[PDB]
Structures are given as C-alpha cells and as structure tokens.
Copies of this chain bind each other. A is one copy, B any other.
Amino acid sequence: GDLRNVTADKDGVADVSIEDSVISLSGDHCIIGRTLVVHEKADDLGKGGNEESTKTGNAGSRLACGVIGIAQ
C-alpha cells in the first residue's frame, strides 16, 4: 500500500487537481522614475555559512552571499 498521492479521472473538460505541492504566482512590477541612485558597502556576508536545498525553485535570479545592487 502507501500510495501517498493518487489522482484518478474518467472524463471531464479542463479539470484541475493539485495534490501536495507549492504554487506561487506574481504580477507586474512596474517602476517609473527619473533618477535612481544606489550606494552600497558590504564587509562580511559569510564566515562558514552552511546551506542546503532539495527540490526548491524560484522564478528569478538565484544567488548566495550577494551584493546585487539593483535587481529586476
């Protein structure tokens, strides 16, 4: 036994089935301006930092110990 996830189906138009998952949606991110200024200083961002990841994801830029400055 121990099926742990089962999605049966016989007919049906445009049926949706979401079992144990993670869904994330965003929209538009407009920025209108006339002057953008960024000043930054960093000195110590990692001193033996361990990091793990298993079955992860994101809809953008991925980084560890970053000084991006201006992202998008």
Q: Which residues of B contact A4 (CB under 8 A)?
A: 2-5
How many copies of the polypeptide does the oligomer hold?
A: 3
Given A14-B15, A72-B31: A56 in contact with B55 (beta carbons within 8 A):
yes
> How many residues on A have C-beta within 8 angstroms of the other chain's C-beta atoms?
72
B21 touches A19 (CB 8 A): yes
Within 8 A of B (CB), among A28-42: 28-42
A25 CB, nearest partner CB in chain B, Å: 5
Binding site for B on A (CB under 8 A): 1-72
Could you pull out 10 A-B pairs where Cβ atoms are within 8 angstroms? A7-B8, A11-B12, A22-B23, A26-B26, A28-B28, A31-B72, A39-B40, A41-B43, A42-B42, A64-B66
